[PDB]
Nucleic acid binder design. Structure first.
Ligand code: MG
Ligand code: MG
Length: 1208
RNA sequence: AAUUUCUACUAAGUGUAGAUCGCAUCCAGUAAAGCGGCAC
């Protein structure tokens, strides 16, 4: 059997199929006349309204708990906070005190005051009505329809967690609000006497309050007062100042500190206000009104930009030791902008970490580099002083930063000038915004220039309780920035609006004035649920009974004079493990049966269940009781065909239940007069809809949609309960959003150009009209039907363990390698159990089969035309969205290609772990699309079907492969998920497949001395006359950071030629030996002399050495690419194989499915696969029961050992 | 340029080929990675 075979019927999975519901006959007229719809439509309107009222009571609630709270954890907390640290994980004691501050807040919500009636049915039933007429009325409407608020309900209970999320109130109460209060205490202590006694308390004490005193709000025990919004407003008014209910405009503390510019030493810190807590879709008038309002030259966002300009202009005035830059991407970027390279800061910091941790004897090891890396990441931030500590003299870090920041503000001001007419009161919109390209680009330009300023500027927060900070700097900075933060919302909303499809998918749920509408199908509650399913020939229908006529479907003849619909009776026995004991210990059954006490005692004590009070006979007695009770229960034994296993072969009660559950459900069809119900439709006693997708069209002649097959199979004789119909069906109405007269149309009888350049037919002429987006021009009913797949699994085991066991015992196991490439969206390499390539090719082109005809689509050319489009459109939003969606389409094609390969080779899949990576600019499928791809792959593999197989066949629609576990998280895409193994890409592309040689030397020229050392660290350097080549023979031991190489000693030869970047005002090509001959001649070095390393070091000037190294580096540069030309991105290796000939990639370009990789893209997919072979190799070394514990994570050192020894 | 819906189409003439429970994240490979259904 194929390894694949053993993976069927493993676990249940549930899916919902969607269809269009086409109203038949007079149904729509009746629906309108009886006005059934409007009930469900206004609810849809007021939904948003009621939500606001729920937020109202939520906010009164939050302010009942918050008025009532005294933080106990706090006071230790304040003293520790002002303890000024002193670290050594003494602060660790405190970081656990923090969490308990949020813990105390969460529990105070939950703990008391009728929190419980919050996200359950009783909140809009009674609670909202008793809290605060035009609003009570809207809430009343929703009753028995509490469904509407479930997604809302989940979004709002995250409010009260200890989650340390920006969602949490507690995080807000303690994490942001409290720290500011503390930070302000230390400002208040330092800046006390600046206040005039009359000036100080007298205006503030009286006009802001007349209660309390100003001093109070800078005492630690006063914080709890400031948890609620009033105390927050009171606090912020003390800092900011007040209106005064008149002209008075009483001054705040910050103004006074400002007015102490009279000393003009100033830079005396100002207080930071406390965070209060707890767009434009609709119209162009709306979208424009917001842009004008938030971004004009006297808006507050523009005010905060001028202040930040003033602040940073005085950057020199502040203490570089007390100004921090958050650690993360901002460090790479600012490194680039300050010094001129990405990794500089990281590099200097590695130079300093080594000296401390790097033992002289010690040789750098992968772990060492991993741990040092964990340390860097862990560092929260860097002061400007520290950054200047890396600053080479003749560069000022603060000043270079000043010129960069100021530059960015100047770029905002120039972009304002270019957008100036848009902010005229006089301005009006000539064209619709989607129509109006020129305007949209003006808006995007400005938004981008401010967003980028914001996003860059945001870096100067060390995201820490940093011990010493320039509070004078961060007072001004935090005041101004917080407004600037406002841009991100505006930006997103405006972009979502432009980016929108011209049509809308908004819709509303239909109950037809019935809270319990369409709860179930199979169940005979049809008088209650009032929906059912009809069949006629090949067509299926949804039939909805009017309340006054529920039984109308009951009494219908099986008329055979001419024609009948088939009528649905669905039988489901739900949850036998709860139900069988519920029914059969019923008082009525108890009457029916004089059940033995032996049975009752077994149940009550549960000696049937597992749990070591279980008795097998007791279990069997229970079963037999149930079995026999089943014979004598009409409702069930006239519904289902029970065929029970012998009682003895049942291991546990659970074994018995699966059979009840399995046989528990039956579906079959009744017979009902077509003419009779047809008339029921006419009279409006019954409403009918055809359940439809294009595959039900009389002109559909192609292979159907997968979901179409699922739906039909529901009612096919061959389907023995593998896919089942479930309740929870919903009907929606999707109001039309396009007007038919306004659609783009290709008129009948005129040729339409075909767009696929690989389609050999150039035009199409149809005799009817084709309309863009036609389906959105009509009101549309849609029907979502839930199904159950593999509800009663027979094969239970751990999927990961079973994959390992089968791989352990397989003689020629096959692996599919997938890699993302530079010249190829995706590239695939199939390999046997020994590393021989069986298949290699690009997936740039997706080839489709219809009939016997194959037509391909080159998705890489598509992306290329769209990238040119993005260039022509100056990178506007919509092209960006078009590219994202194209890619998401492409990956739905690829999923199918991978499935065929898995089925074809019974192969395991090898994929990049995207939790270990380097971003590569060259590759076209970015991380975020690839992650989506990997999720989709896993999802398919949960149940994998080939549509063209006969459904009952293994791998067909009734026996899908389940070779993957359910997706949990992206973080969870690591190690192995069933047939999928996640591999790190380290050292899979730039490595000789033939030898496993990898360049581990550093050839950058550094110093004349270093170059000599380099040259000297070589064993030999000799020109070989016979083979006309230079031979560099080396030991990796003599060079640093080569621990991973297994074959230490490699001989390098000049042979072949290489493509060099060779930038000139950037490509040229270079031969290798010619360069070695040229350069040596150039300097008077005769090279026919053995071991010229002593000789070479005799040279006196950089020029020899600078160019010797550049020459060397190129030779070790295996991967070569012009980038104008698809034709070559080749791989050539400076090292001979055992047989003595060097690997070139171009010698494999010609062949089909050649033994070694054909280009560098292939090499990468090839080597990703070999790492899985390595993993398989570890399985083959372990005992069956240890397999689950074996480690798949190959280490650069294991990898190179494997790559270099397995080649032979 | 037709769709349950999406993407690419026109595929031989009202359609073709994949894919397709729902929402949120869609740009930072140093922040986040989860919330639903379903099932237990
Ligand atoms: Mg089809
Ligand atoms: Mg389209």
């Amino acid at each position: 059997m194929s390894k694949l075979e053993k993976f069927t019927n493993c676990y249940s999975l549930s899916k919902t199929l969607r269809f269009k519901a086409i109203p038949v006959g007079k149904t729509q007229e009746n629906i309108d006349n009886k006005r059934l719809l409007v009930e469900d439509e206004k609810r849809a309107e007021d939904y948003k309204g009621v939500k606001k009222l729920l937020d109202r009571y939520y906010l009164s609630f939050i302010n009942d708990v918050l008025h009532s709270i005294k933080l106990k954890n706090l006071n230790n907390y304040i003293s520790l906070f002002r303890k000024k640290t002193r670290t050594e994980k003494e602060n660790k004691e405190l970081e656990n005190l923090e969490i308990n501050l949020r813990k105390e807040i969460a529990k105070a919500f939950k703990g008391n005051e009728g929190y419980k009636s919050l996200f359950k049915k009783d909140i809009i039933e009674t609670i909202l009505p008793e809290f605060l007429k035009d609003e009570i009325a809207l809430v009343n409407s929703f009753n028995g329809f509490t469904t509407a608020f479930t997604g809302f309900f989940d979004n709002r209970e995250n409010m009260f967690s200890e989650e340390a999320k920006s969602t949490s109130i507690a995080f807000r109460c303690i994490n942001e609000n409290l720290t500011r209060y503390i930070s302000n205490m230390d400002i208040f202590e330092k800046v006390d006497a600046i206040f005039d006694k009359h000036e100080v308390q007298e205006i503030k004490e009286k006009i802001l309050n007349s209660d309390y005193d100003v001093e109070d709000f800078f005492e630690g025990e006063f914080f709890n007062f400031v948890l609620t919004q009033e105390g927050i407003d009171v606090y912020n008014a003390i800092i900011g100042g007040f209106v005064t209910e008149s002209g008075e405009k009483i001054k705040g503390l910050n103004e006074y500190i400002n007015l102490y510019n009279q000393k003009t030493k100033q830079k005396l810190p100002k207080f930071k206000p406390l965070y209060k807590q707890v767009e434009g879709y609709t119209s162009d008038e709306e979208v424009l009104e917001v842009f004008r309002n938030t971004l004009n030259k006297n808006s507050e966002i523009f005010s905060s930009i001028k202040k930040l300009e003033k602040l940073f202009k005085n950057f020199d005035e502040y203490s570089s030791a007390g100004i921090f830059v958050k650690n993360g991407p901002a460090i790479s970027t600012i490194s680039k902008d300050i010094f001129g390279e990405w990794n500089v800061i990281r590099d200097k910091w590695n130079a300093e970490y080594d000296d401390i941790h790097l033992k002289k004897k010690a040789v750098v090891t992968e772990k060492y580099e991993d741990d040092r890396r964990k340390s860097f990441k862990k560092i929260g931030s860097f002061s400007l002083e520290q950054l200047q500590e890396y600053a080479d003299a003749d560069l000022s870090v603060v000043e270079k930063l000043k010129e960069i920041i100021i530059q960015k503000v100047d770029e905002i001001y120039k972009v304002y000038g270019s957008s100036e007419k848009l902010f005229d009161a006089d301005f009006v919109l000539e064209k619709s915004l989607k129509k109006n390209d020129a305007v949209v680009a003006i808006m995007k330009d400005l938004l981008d220039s401010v967003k980028s300023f914001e996003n860059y500027i945001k870096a100067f927060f060390g995201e820490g309780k940093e011990t010493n900070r320039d509070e004078s700097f961060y007072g001004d900075f935090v005041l101004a920035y917080d407004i600037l933060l406002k841009v991100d919302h505006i930006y997103d909303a405006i972009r979502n609006y432009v980016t929108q499809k011209p049509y809308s998918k908004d819709k509303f749920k239909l109950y037809f004035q019935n809270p319990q509408f369409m709860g179930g199908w199979d169940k005979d509650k049809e008088t209650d649920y009032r929906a059912t399913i009809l069949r006629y020939g090949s067509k299926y229908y949804l039939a909805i009974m009017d309340k006054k006529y529920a039984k109308c479907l009951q009494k219908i003849d099986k008329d055979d004079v001419n024609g009948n619909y088939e009528k649905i009776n669905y039988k489901l026995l739900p949850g036998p493990n709860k139900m069988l004991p519920k029914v059969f210990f019923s008082k009525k059954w108890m009457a029916y049966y004089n059940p033995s006490e032996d049975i009752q005692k077994i149940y009550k004590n549960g000696t049937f269940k597992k749990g070591d009070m279980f008795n097998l006979n007791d279990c069997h007695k229970l079963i037999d009781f149930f079995k026999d009770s089943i014979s004598r229960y009409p409702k069930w034994s006239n519904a289902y065909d029970f065929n029970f296993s012998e009682t003895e072969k049942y291991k546990d009660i659970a074994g018995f239940y699966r059979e009840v559950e399995e046989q528990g459900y039956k579906v079959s069809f009744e017979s009902a007069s077509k003419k009779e119900v047809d008339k029921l439709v006419e009279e409006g006693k019954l409403y009918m809809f055809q359940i439809y997708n294009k595959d039900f069209s009389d002109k559909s002649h192609g292979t159907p949609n997968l979901h179409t097959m699922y739906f039909k199979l529901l009612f096919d004789e061959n389907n023995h309960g593998q896919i089942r119909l479930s309740g929870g069906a919903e009907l929606f109405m999707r109001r039309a959003s396009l007007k038919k007269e306004e659609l783009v149309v290709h008129p009948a009888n005129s040729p339409i150009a075909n767009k696929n350049p690989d389609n050999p037919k150039k035009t199409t002429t149809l005799s009817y009209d084709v309309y863009k987006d036609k389906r959105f021009s009509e009101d549309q009913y849609e029907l979502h039907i839930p199904i159950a797949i593999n509800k009663c699994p027979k094969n239970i085991f751990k999927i990961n363990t079973e994959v390992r066991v089968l791989l352990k015992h397989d003689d020629n196991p096959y692996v599919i390698g997938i890699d993302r490439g530079e010249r190829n969206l995706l590239y695939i390499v199939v390999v046997d159990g020994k590393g021989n390539i069986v298949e290699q090719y690009s997936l740039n082109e997706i080839i489709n089969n219809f009939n016997g005809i194959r037509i391909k689509t080159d998705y890489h050319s598509l992306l290329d035309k769209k990238e040119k489009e993005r260039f022509e459109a100056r990178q506007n939003w919509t092209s960006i969205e078009n590219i994202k969606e194209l890619k998401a389409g492409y990956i739905s094609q690829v999923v199918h290609k991978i499935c065929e390969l898995v089925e074809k080779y019974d192969a395991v899949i090898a994929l990049e772990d995207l939790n270990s990576g380097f971003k590569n600019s060259r590759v076209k499928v970015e991380k975020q699309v690839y992650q989506k791809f990997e999720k989709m792959l896993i999802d398919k593999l949960n149940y994998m079907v080939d549509k063209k197989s006969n459904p009952c066949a293994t791998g067909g629609a009734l026996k899908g492969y389940q070779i993957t576990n359910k997706f949990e998280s992206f973080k969870s895409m690591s190690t192995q998920n069933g047939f999928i193994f996640y591999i790190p890409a380290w050292l899979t592309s730039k490595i000789d497949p033939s030898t496993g040689f990898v360049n581990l030397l550093k050839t950058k020229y550094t110093s004349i001395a270093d170059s000599k050392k380099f040259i000297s660290s070589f064993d030999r350097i000799m020109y070989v006359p016979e083979e006309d080549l230079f031979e560099f023979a080396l030991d990796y031991k003599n060079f640093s950071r080569t621990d991973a190489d297994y074959i230490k000693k490699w001989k390098l030869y000049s042979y072949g030629n290489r493509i060099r970047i060779f930038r000139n005002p950037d490509w040229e090509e270079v031969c290798l030996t010619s360069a070695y001959k040229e350069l040596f001649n150039k300097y008077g070095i005769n090279y026919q002399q053995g071991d010229i390393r002593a000789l070479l070091c005799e040279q006196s000037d950089k020029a020899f050495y600078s160019s010797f190294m550049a020459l060397m580096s190129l030779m070790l540069q295996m991967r070569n690419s012009i980038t104008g030309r698809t034709d070559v991105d080749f791989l050539i290796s400076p090292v001979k194989n055992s047989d003595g000939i060097f690997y070139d990639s171009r010698n494999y370009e010609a062949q089909e499915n050649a033994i070694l990789p054909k280009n560098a893209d292939a090499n990468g997919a090839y080597n990703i696969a070999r790492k899985v072979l390595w993993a398989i190799g570890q399985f083959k070394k372990a005992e069956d029961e240890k397999l689950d514990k074996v480690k798949i994570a190959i280490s650069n050192k294991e990898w190179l050992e494997y790559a270099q020894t397995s080649v032979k």
